[PDB]
Amino acid sequence: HMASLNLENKTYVIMGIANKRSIAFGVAKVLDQLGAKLVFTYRKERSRKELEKLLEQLNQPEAHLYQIDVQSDEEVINGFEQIGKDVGNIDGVYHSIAFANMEDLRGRFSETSREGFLLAQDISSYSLTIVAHEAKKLMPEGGSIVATTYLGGEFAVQNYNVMGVAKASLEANVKYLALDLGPDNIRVNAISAGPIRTLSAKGVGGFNTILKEIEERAPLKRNVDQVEVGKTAAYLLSDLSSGVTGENIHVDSGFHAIK
Amino acid sequence: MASLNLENKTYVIMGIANKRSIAFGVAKVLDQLGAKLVFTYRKERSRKELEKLLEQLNQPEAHLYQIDVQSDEEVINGFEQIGKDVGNIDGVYHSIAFANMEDLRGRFSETSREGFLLAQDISSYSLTIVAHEAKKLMPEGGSIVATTYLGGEFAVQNYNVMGVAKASLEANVKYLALDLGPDNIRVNAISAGPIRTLSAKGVGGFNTILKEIEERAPLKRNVDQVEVGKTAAYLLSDLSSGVTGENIHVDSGFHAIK
Amino acid sequence: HMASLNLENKTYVIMGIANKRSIAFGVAKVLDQLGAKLVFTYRKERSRKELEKLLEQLNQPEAHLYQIDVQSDEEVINGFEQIGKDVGNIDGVYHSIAFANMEDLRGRFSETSREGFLLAQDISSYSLTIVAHEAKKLMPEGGSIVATTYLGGEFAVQNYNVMGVAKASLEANVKYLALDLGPDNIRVNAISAGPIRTLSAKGVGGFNTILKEIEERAPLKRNVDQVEVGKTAAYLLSDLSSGVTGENIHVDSGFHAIK
Amino acid sequence: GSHMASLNLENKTYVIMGIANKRSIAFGVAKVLDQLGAKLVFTYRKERSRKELEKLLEQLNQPEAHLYQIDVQSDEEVINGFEQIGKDVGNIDGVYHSIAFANMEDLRGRFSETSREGFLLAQDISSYSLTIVAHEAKKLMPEGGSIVATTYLGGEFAVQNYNVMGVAKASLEANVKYLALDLGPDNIRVNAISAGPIRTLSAKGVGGFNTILKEIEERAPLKRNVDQVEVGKTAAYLLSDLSSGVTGENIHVDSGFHAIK
Ligand SMILES: NC(=O)C1=CN([C@@H]2O[C@H](COP(=O)(O)OP(=O)(O)OC[C@H]3O[C@@H](n4cnc5c(N)ncnc54)[C@H](OP(=O)(O)O)[C@@H]3O)[C@@H](O)[C@H]2O)C=CC1
Ligand SMILES: NC(=O)C1=CN([C@@H]2O[C@H](COP(=O)(O)OP(=O)(O)OC[C@H]3O[C@@H](n4cnc5c(N)ncnc54)[C@H](OP(=O)(O)O)[C@@H]3O)[C@@H](O)[C@H]2O)C=CC1
Ligand SMILES: NC(=O)C1=CN([C@@H]2O[C@H](COP(=O)(O)OP(=O)(O)OC[C@H]3O[C@@H](n4cnc5c(N)ncnc54)[C@H](OP(=O)(O)O)[C@@H]3O)[C@@H](O)[C@H]2O)C=CC1
Ligand SMILES: NC(=O)C1=CN([C@@H]2O[C@H](COP(=O)(O)OP(=O)(O)OC[C@H]3O[C@@H](n4cnc5c(N)ncnc54)[C@H](OP(=O)(O)O)[C@@H]3O)[C@@H](O)[C@H]2O)C=CC1
Ligand SMILES: C=C(CC/C=C\C=C\C[C@H](C)CC(=O)C[C@@H](O)CNC(=O)[C@H](C)[C@@H](C)OC(N)=O)C[C@@H](C)C/C(C)=C/C(=O)O
Ligand SMILES: C=C(CC/C=C\C=C\C[C@H](C)CC(=O)C[C@@H](O)CNC(=O)[C@H](C)[C@@H](C)OC(N)=O)C[C@@H](C)C/C(C)=C/C(=O)O
Ligand SMILES: C=C(CC/C=C\C=C\C[C@H](C)CC(=O)C[C@@H](O)CNC(=O)[C@H](C)[C@@H](C)OC(N)=O)C[C@@H](C)C/C(C)=C/C(=O)O
Ligand SMILES: C=C(CC/C=C\C=C\C[C@H](C)CC(=O)C[C@@H](O)CNC(=O)[C@H](C)[C@@H](C)OC(N)=O)C[C@@H](C)C/C(C)=C/C(=O)O
Known part of the structure; x- marks a missing residue:
């Protein structure tokens, strides 16, 4: 077969599950159903307890969980060396990690603090650069890296403020x-997801406003879910997307195409 | 959920001419995944080739239709007839462009009014009318994909009138x-890198562009019809649910660099 | 050389004045105040009567008016040969011409007629290609060509339908x-104007809706006028914009930058 | 207030951040704004830039040299610098931002090898600087005004050897x-100029810069490179009221290279 979505014999690291609503979990459910071996990474202990509870919903024989705060060179370098020891070589990484201080997001963008701006850049953009350098060690045959972005990296959207500049950084990253990494047969792509109700998104002002605008104005007149992101992640992570790199696929009901 | 099993799916493929046609790469891939395929052609030469090619595939019933997309009638009747012979479809792959060599050889400022509107008619408007008629056969929803080139987004040497046609197609x-979003019909494009085809063979310095892709593009290699077919499988199937108005570059990353 | 907006000794052809509200007239008023010699082109006789009435508002010694319907190779070729005879060599052309059948604009875009689509392409896009070829004859030293576009050429906007695909064609044109024409020292650029109340725009559905959305959502929280387009036209037509070509400048209160 | 279109900048005052020597893009902006009769305030980091500025001001027609030391890495130097400009010359009509930096270690490397410290440094100087400069300069622009920053195509496309500075420019362009x-509702316009390659202090002694200069001459529509003055001309347009109704725009002053592939 030329075209295949059979991911038995494939291993993927999934960074950024926090709870059942996490985009990264949508990616996990889908890659699992297609028979991939999945390694997971988390920051907080609360995310670990949730992960172990969630792995029962999946068909992963062995739970391989690793604590990686992407702010620490060491936790990232050691985390990936340790993954290489425990499961061997991998076929790709799904990156589902962003953060900004609520103080900076609530503000006028011109009021953003130097520390808040560099924090957003560090977690939301630089993380992908170091993750890529370390994961490359486990992908000598080649592989696929995917990161998650939002339209706010391409256009100034109300309230996204510092995270928009972080996503523009990520998209250029x-x-x-x-x-x-192209000459090493490593593909790097982004998924620009439409708005999804998640732990990160819950309790940020006017998120219900954007959800309703998507239903009313977007071509498909509906919102997307974690599984739809997962399906496009399957395409980008698998060899189905061979010859696609440096690409940004909008999984957003067509909102990006309209004005 | 996630599936590349296309048994019980039916797709119309417009624009096979020979074994090198991008549309044939799409056919080979969709066939392997178990889809029922309807084909459309313009010239009789394309029909003879299609019948010879269908032996390479696992299509029980050869359903072939003559549609020159310049004729409202051939398009309207072609699709009504497909609806009668196979019923409702799940999508259309559009693999059709043309410009007069006179216009392509020239300086773009020398382009003829007739040559410009011809390129627009075949290469862009075709998708609008194909979409209107195919919508009749997709009452549950479906996916339409058209084939474009980087030259629709940037001025490329020698693409001339076809660049303005592709920009038209991409906006189309x-x-x-x-x-068609509210009718649960998705419309997307694949921006293919350079591929040696019947249409492309015997346009000056095509080997020069192939070598520039190998040297400068991120993946340091060219793409083929099957790689376009793989991305076509994604866009035509429900794997790409929530993706519409998108242009996916299957071009080894060339679009991302300068 | 050093920077000047003194356009005495410069001659510009302005295509597409119809009445006092025409964007092209905003361009004329501005270029006139800066002391340029202005040649004008029109299609209908109604536009000629209006032009002569309007030229009194300007400081053009000699009215040079020419009938050019851009659908006719002959009217365009002869028009420009005749301009070359009557005023000699020119420094640029401002293109302010578009048209589609209201039947096509009122419709669903998928219902668009082959004749209506090619008509929109012919007047709104191809016109610039042949205008450029003939005007090049009068610009052996070099010069600047500017065409007028709308955001609908870059994004699917409600109700713009066939004219959006025409503007995308124009922008690629x-x-x-x-x-x-770069190697002949001819610069070709576009101005993407925000919504302006004109003869063409008056009585096309939901134009008042877009005007109000610009005031509410656009960075500058206001609409633009013909003169603001004229000011940016002065920049693009003069040597102030040397080194700028293949560019699309949005004169639209920043609407293009936001989502 | 008689010509609708005006490039007469007598009675206008502009802050110009990032002159280092005679080759600096910011100096091209200065020469042009000066010729049009603007009052110019200048800002620098190193003392070497101050000595050069004083030597350069003789080439201009600025009666009183107003020079201020602002390292954009310091909230204090930026806040105090702008308060002090407000005291010495009063309200301003705009700011030209001509400031970027990355460690040569990071630029010479493979982009995937970039250090966390080097990446955040590039972001801090090359992008965040504009955000805080904008916040403080807004205090001196209660009538409104225009802010322009300098970028390169490498913020929009992966260009060989630009590495971490490409991600910084993409950050700047989104900034x-x-x-x-x-700042739109406060009648402050914010725009960028994407300059083509120019021989400057910053650019001199980075590998393969002569390669890009020659590729521009061969492949770009105008078949020629641009200079600091051409950037200055487009800066005059963006800084003056000639560009009223233009904001969030990126104007390529690059002989059309951005339009081709
Ligand atoms: N929700 C949405 O609408 C959209 C989200 N996205 C992007 O998708 C991605 C995931 O978002 P989403 O699923 O909503 O939110 P989640 O709540 O799942 O994600 C937040 C995640 O980020 C992790 N994280 C944050 N900082 C760090 C760090 N320093 N080190 C390691 N992990 C960290 C969290 O781990 P912990 O809790 O353990 O700290 C958690 O797993 C993000 O990049 C987001 O910007 C893009 C478009 C839309
Ligand atoms: N080759 C390349 O590098 C690239 C090609 N593309 C695009 O891919 C698509 C296919 O290209 P390629 O595979 O080279 O094409 P081929 O020339 O191998 O196939 C082209 C098809 O267009 C069909 N066609 C032409 N005119 C009409 C018409 N009036 N009505 C119906 N069908 C028509 C031809 O049929 P017939 O012979 O019967 O006229 C032929 O089947 C085109 O849109 C092209 O622009 C995009 C990027 C790259
Ligand atoms: N108004 C708006 O909000 C915006 C308009 N635009 C674009 O701006 C440009 C100017 O439009 P606007 O000022 O509204 O239009 P006008 O109100 O000036 O009316 C249309 C103009 O088009 C000319 N025209 C139409 N067909 C032909 C032809 N075949 N040959 C020559 N001239 C022709 C008309 O001449 P006549 O009637 O004398 O035949 C007239 O001058 C257009 O290209 C338009 O698409 C862009 C953004 C916004
Ligand atoms: N040259 C080119 O080919 C192009 C350059 N650009 C961009 O134009 C801008 C200026 O470029 P160019 O003329 O080449 O640069 P120059 O090096 O000639 O000037 C660079 C300036 O950055 C200043 N600078 C560096 N760090 C800081 C800091 N922490 N605080 C304040 N100032 C600082 C330097 O001042 P000091 O040395 O005193 O610290 C210097 O004035 C930059 O944004 C660059 O990215 C854009 C396109 C092309
Ligand atoms: C324009 C949108 C509307 C909402 C405004 C801003 C959204 C910012 C998203 C950003 C990722 C949120 C944070 O950084 C959250 C953090 O400050 C507080 N929350 C937490 O720490 C929770 C417990 C954990 C899970 O947080 C993280 N990230 O680890 C943007 C919307 C409409 C689209 C979105 C949400 C895009 C995106 O996620 O980037
Ligand atoms: C920049 C590129 C270099 C190639 C330049 C021009 C090629 C344009 C493609 C266009 C579709 C060619 C024709 O229409 C060919 C036609 O005029 C003569 N040939 C035929 O009629 C044959 C028999 C039939 C089968 O061809 C057709 N089309 O019916 C672009 C290259 C790098 C990539 C390409 C080929 C892009 C594209 O196809 O759009
Ligand atoms: C979303 C928008 C609302 C308006 C929708 C479509 C407008 C298209 C513009 C197009 C040029 C209008 C026509 O062709 C009008 C024509 O059908 C009838 N009127 C005329 O013929 C008059 C007499 C003459 C002068 O008109 C012409 N052109 O010949 C788009 C808006 C928000 C932005 C606009 C108005 C853009 C634009 O005008 O291009
Ligand atoms: C892709 C291009 C080819 C060259 C590659 C990288 C150039 C990056 C520009 C960057 C801003 C320069 C530095 O950071 C150099 C710095 O580390 C060493 N020089 C200095 O420290 C001097 C003393 C000071 C004055 O300079 C600064 N800036 O602090 C990009 C080229 C073709 C276009 C350019 C040069 C664009 C640009 O400058 O942004």
């Missing part, structure tokens, strides 16, 4: 990584 | 996506 | 012309 | 858009  | 895709 |  | 939306 993807392109520079694609050009750098 | 977006307006169709917004129009 | 600008790029290919810029690459072709 | 411009978010600033445009935030």
Whole structure:
């Protein structure tokens, strides 16, 4: 077969599950159903307890969980060396990690703090660069890296503020990584997801406003879910997307195409 | 959920001419995944080739239809007839462009009014009318994919009138996506890198562009019809649910660099 | 050389004045105040009567008016040969011409007629290609060509339908012309104007809706006028914009930058 | 207030951040704004830049040299610098931002090898600087005004060897858009100029810069490179009221290279 979505014999690291609503979990459910071996990474202990509870919903024989705060060079370097020891070589990484201080997001963008801006950049963009460098060690045959972005990296959207500049950074990060790791047969791409109700998104002002605008104005007149992101993640992580790199696929009911 | 099993799916494929046609790469891939395939052609030469090619495939019943997309009638009748012979479809792959060599050889400012509107008619408007008629056979929803080139987004040497046609096509895709979205019809494009085809063979310095892709593109290699077919499988299937008005570059990353 | 907006000794052809509200007239008022010699082109006789009435508002010694319907190779070729005879060599052309059948604009975009689509393409896009070819004859030293576009060429906007695909065609036309005529020191650029109340725009459904959305959502929280387009036209037509070609400048209160 | 279109900048005052020597893009902006009769305030980091500025001001027609030391890495130097400009010359009509930096270690490397410290440094100087400069300069622009920052194509496309600075420029370009939306209601316009390659102090002695200069001459529509003055001309347009109604825009002053592939 030329075209295949059979991921038995494939191993993927999934960074950024927090609870059942996490986009990264949508990616996990889908990759699991297609028979991939899945390694998971988390920051907080609360995410670990949830992960173990969630793995029962999946068909992963062995829970391989690793604590990686992407703010620490060491936790990232050691985390990936340790994954290499425990499961061997991998076929890709799904990156589902962002953070900004609520103080900066609530503010006017011009009021953003130097510390808040560099924090958003560090977690939401630089993380992908170091994750890529370490994961490359486990992908000598080649593989696929995917990161999660939002329209706010391409256009100034109300309230996204500092995270918009972080996502623009991430999106350019993807392109520079694609050009750098291409000759090593490593593809780097992004999924621009439409708004999804998650732990991160719950209790940020006017999120219900954007959900309703998508239903009313977006071509498909509906919102997307974690599984739809997972399906496009399957395409980008598998060899189905061979010849695609430096690309940004909008899984957003067509909202990106309209004005 | 996630599936590349396309048994019980039916797709119309417009624009096979020979074994090198991008549309044939799409056919080979969709066939392997178990889809029922309807084919459309213009010239009789394409029909003879299609029948010879269908032996390479596992299609029980050869359903072939003559549609020159310049004729409202051939398009309207072609699709009504497909609806009668096989019933409702799940999508259309559009693999059709043409411009006069006179216009392509020229300086773009020398382009003829007739040559410009011809390129627009075949290469862009075709998708609008194909979409209108195919919508009749997709009352549950479906996916339409058209084939474009980077030259629709940037001025490329020698693409001339076809660049303005592809920019037209790419905007066509977006307006169709917004129009047919509420009918649960997705409309997307694949921006293929350079591939040696019947259409492309015997346009000067095509080997030069192939070598520039190998040297400068991130993956340091060219793409083929099957790689387009793989991305077509994604866009035509429900794997790409929630993706519409999108342009996916199957071009080894060339679009991302300068 | 050093920076000047003094356009005495410069001559510009302005295509597409119809009445006092025409964007092209905003361009004329501005270029006139800066002391340029202005040649004008029109289609209908109604536009000629209006032009002569309007020229009294300007400081053009000699009225040079020419009938050019851009659908006719002959009217365009002869028009420009005749301009070359009557005023000699020119420094640029401002293109302010578009048209589609209201039947096509009122419809669903998928219902668009083959004749209506090619009509929109012919007047709204191809016109620039042949205008450029003939005007090049009068610009052996070099010059600047500017065409007028709308955001609907970059994004699917409700109700713009066939004219959006025409503007995308125009915008690509600008790029290919810029690459072709660049070596002849001819610059080709576009202005993406925000919504303006004109003869063409008056009595097309939901135009008041877009005007109000611009005031509410656009960065500058206001609409633009013909003169603001004229000011940016002065920049693009003069040597102030040397080194700028294949560019699309949005004169739209920042609406293009947001989502 | 008689010509609708005007490039006469007598009675206008502009802060110009990032002159280092005669080759600096910011100096091209200065020469042009000066010729049009603007009052110019200048900002620098190193003392070497101050000595050069004083030597350069003789080439201009600025009666009183107003020079201020602002390292954009320091909230204090930026806040105090702008308060002090407000005291010495009063309200301003805009800011030209011509400031970027990355460690040569990071630029020479493979982009995937980039250090966390090097990445955040590039972001801090090359992008965040504009956000805080904008916040403080807004205090001196209660009537409104225009802010322009300098970027390169490498913020929009992966270009060989630009590495971490490409991600910094993409950050800057998004910064411009978010600033445009935030400060628009205060009648402050925020725009970028994407300059083609120019021989400057910053650019001199980075490998393969001569390669890109030659590729521009061969492949770009105008078949020629641009200079600091051409950037200055487009800066005059963006800084003056000639560009009224333009904000969140990125104007390529690059002989059309951005339009081709
Ligand atoms: N929800 C949405 O609408 C959209 C989200 N996205 C993007 O999708 C991705 C995931 O978001 P979403 O699923 O909503 O939110 P979640 O609540 O799942 O994600 C937050 C995740 O980020 C992890 N995280 C944050 N900081 C760090 C760090 N320093 N080190 C390691 N992990 C960290 C969290 O771990 P812990 O809790 O253990 O700290 C958690 O797993 C993000 O990049 C987001 O920007 C894109 C478009 C839309
Ligand atoms: N080759 C390349 O590098 C790239 C090609 N593309 C695009 O891919 C698509 C297919 O290209 P390629 O595979 O080279 O094409 P081929 O020339 O191998 O196939 C082209 C098809 O267009 C059909 N066609 C032409 N005119 C009409 C018409 N008036 N009515 C109906 N069908 C028509 C031809 O049929 P017939 O012979 O019967 O006229 C032929 O089947 C085109 O849109 C092209 O622009 C995009 C990027 C790259
Ligand atoms: N108004 C708006 O909000 C916006 C308009 N635009 C674009 O701006 C440009 C100017 O439009 P606007 O000022 O509204 O239009 P006008 O109100 O000036 O009316 C249309 C103009 O088009 C000319 N025209 C139409 N067909 C032909 C032809 N075949 N040959 C020559 N001239 C022709 C008309 O001449 P006549 O009637 O004398 O034949 C007239 O001058 C257009 O290209 C338009 O799409 C862009 C953004 C916004
Ligand atoms: N040259 C080119 O080819 C192009 C350059 N650009 C961009 O134009 C801008 C200026 O470029 P160019 O003329 O080449 O640069 P120059 O090096 O000639 O000037 C660079 C300036 O950055 C200043 N600078 C560096 N760090 C800081 C800091 N922490 N605080 C304040 N100022 C600082 C330097 O001042 P000091 O040395 O005193 O610290 C210097 O004035 C940059 O944004 C660059 O990215 C864009 C396109 C092309
Ligand atoms: C324009 C949108 C509307 C909402 C405004 C801002 C959204 C910012 C998203 C950003 C990722 C949120 C945070 O950084 C959250 C953090 O400050 C507080 N929350 C937490 O710490 C929770 C417990 C954990 C899970 O947080 C994290 N991230 O670890 C953007 C919307 C409409 C689209 C979105 C949400 C895009 C995106 O997620 O990037
Ligand atoms: C920049 C590129 C270099 C190639 C330049 C021009 C090619 C344009 C493609 C266009 C579709 C070619 C024709 O229409 C060919 C036609 O005029 C003569 N040939 C035929 O009629 C044959 C018999 C039939 C089968 O061809 C057709 N089309 O019916 C673009 C290259 C790098 C990539 C390409 C080929 C892009 C594209 O196809 O759009
Ligand atoms: C979303 C928008 C609302 C308006 C929708 C479609 C407008 C298209 C513009 C197009 C040029 C209008 C026509 O062709 C009008 C024509 O059908 C009838 N009127 C005329 O013929 C008059 C007499 C003459 C002068 O008109 C012409 N052109 O010949 C788009 C809006 C928000 C933005 C606009 C108005 C863009 C634009 O005008 O291009
Ligand atoms: C892709 C291009 C080819 C060259 C590659 C990288 C150039 C990056 C520009 C960057 C801003 C320069 C530095 O950070 C150099 C710095 O580390 C060493 N120089 C200095 O420290 C001097 C003393 C000071 C004055 O300079 C600064 N800036 O602090 C990009 C080229 C073709 C276009 C350019 C140069 C764009 C740009 O400058 O942004």
